[PDB]
């Protein structure tokens, strides 16, 4: 039996109300609601590091998934709560996971577009994630080639990204940069070898 | 489900010219917190960009050597913990450590957690009567203003003040014996009343703080302070050339005014958001400011909701985000090699179907912004230094009335 009031309090950052409801001791903190959501997921989604740390002190399950297939770590990353992502990684959250959406983006991919530090923390657990492709055969290098910067490109080249990988349509990162009209990443990639 | 309601963009120029995008630019959609962009314009138009909330403190000596204090309020919408800590420091500088009778009038707003969760994202408390407002101000004064100062928090605030070149004492205290409401109608001062004024930060910085955080408390109280819905509609007609066909507001924040099951949201057309942005920018330029003085800058404002808006927008986008159960929104400008461009992007979501919709919508918006940048020959980094947005500055020290 999950608690609506607790889940909402976690999402919204009302630490006082969370501690208050958890103190009465009625609530199983691993109980998932009608869409698979846990208090930990709500806390992570809302970027509330205080509530995450409190919930982690109760030794909640890190690897439960909502209906969208996402763990708390995924909720943190996808909603730009990278301070929460770091806490969850230090707590032992699995980083070799998929975030929601049609593409099957890796957690590393989503972090690589947005927060360099968490991208590094992920790779520190598993170096090969640099070149792990999503469902369309694309890696981080493809995403940032479309929508990122030369600085992103070299960050990934330095972590061992493979320039010559093709997606399921037979395109390289360089090809998708050009198709996206990102002249900056196109130039950076086409000078590289 | 996640999908595009509407997208607009327009080049930033002397004139509001060609607009392109996706969907119906003239259909009202839920705004979520891009509502705050409009609230921001309205505040600046009515109050002036550098307006200061001037709270007046009426200090009268008691026979025991303490002070009585009457607070004459300015309806300051960022008066909470931080501004309280600063006021306590200030009182001690003036040799006031003990208050006998603390009274306050109908304009003194105090919510301890004004700049903190859950006030940032919560439903802002709405006081129907003055009594209810008074009792809540009493509660804060009694429980927070008068209790032992949180040493760790005071010290974090002071570390920031010091970066901002504002002086605060290391270790000030205050004691308050009695606290009660006293309307402005009924306050008259003794022969020996000396009175001093606390100016909060200039409005533009209060707005920068609100927009960074998406602070509902600050936005909702600005809206009430400016006159609420009736006053808002007159503003929208005159400034935005807009009536209920283009825009309907219920609050300053864009937050849900209804239920989880039956939500009610501020709505406007995508066109209306472009107008807002153009007019807000003109206003600020006329006073020597820029859009970045009130709205967040991608990546460069660390303490903001677009701290981690990566991609080619980093350091090249000024924007406000929005998030409600039914919408994910963004509005602002992008700086590119072909100039600056206003934009508004409105997406539908359904958290009730899946909470994963928020994350999906977030990366769609980011990729859309990147695409718009690509098509305008890439980013051009903006001239900007991170504003440290405190509720007080070097002209906030107590001065004679």
Residue numbers in the entry:
A (entry chain B): 28 to 220
B (entry chain A): 26 to 426
From the manuscript:
The use by B. bacteriovorus (and related periplasmic predators) of multiple DD-endopeptidases to decrosslink prey wall, and our observation of specific neutralization of Bd3459 by Bd3460 raised the question as to whether a similar mechanism is used to protect against Bd0816. Bd0816 expression was toxic but was circumvented by mutating the active site Serine residue to Alanine (S58A). The resulting 2.48 Å structure of the Bd0816:Bd3460 complex reveals a conserved mode of binding between the ARP self-protection protein and both predatory DD-endopeptidase targets. Bd0816 is largely structurally equivalent to Bd3459, with a few small differences in surface-exposed loops (loops involved in Bd0816 oligomerization). It is striking that we observe a trimeric form of Bd0816 (burying 1,041 A2 of surface area per monomer, on the borderline for statistically significant oligomers). In-vitro characterization of the Bd0816:Bd3460 complex suggests the 1:1 heterodimer likely represents the dominant form in solution. Comparison of the residues involved in both complexes illustrates that the endopeptidase:self-protection protein interface is conserved, and is likely to be representative of protection mechanisms in related predators.
Here we show that Bdellovibrio bacteriovorus utilizes a small ankyrin repeat protein, Bd3460, to protect itself from endopeptidase activities during entry of prey. We demonstrate that endopeptidase complexation by Bd3460 prevents cell wall decrosslinking, and that both the Bd0816 and Bd3459 targets bind this self-protection protein via a common epitope. Previously, we assigned prey cell rounding to the action of two secreted Bdellovibrio peptidoglycan DD-endopeptidases, Bd0816 and Bd3459, that act to modify the invaded cell wall via hydrolysis of the structural 3-4 peptide crosslinks. In summary, we conclude that we have identified and characterized the first ever self-protection protein encoded by predatory bacteria—ankyrin repeat protein Bd3460 from Bdellovibrio inhibits the prey wall decrosslinking enzymes Bd3459/Bd0816 and in doing so protects the predator from the shape transition that this catalyses in prey.
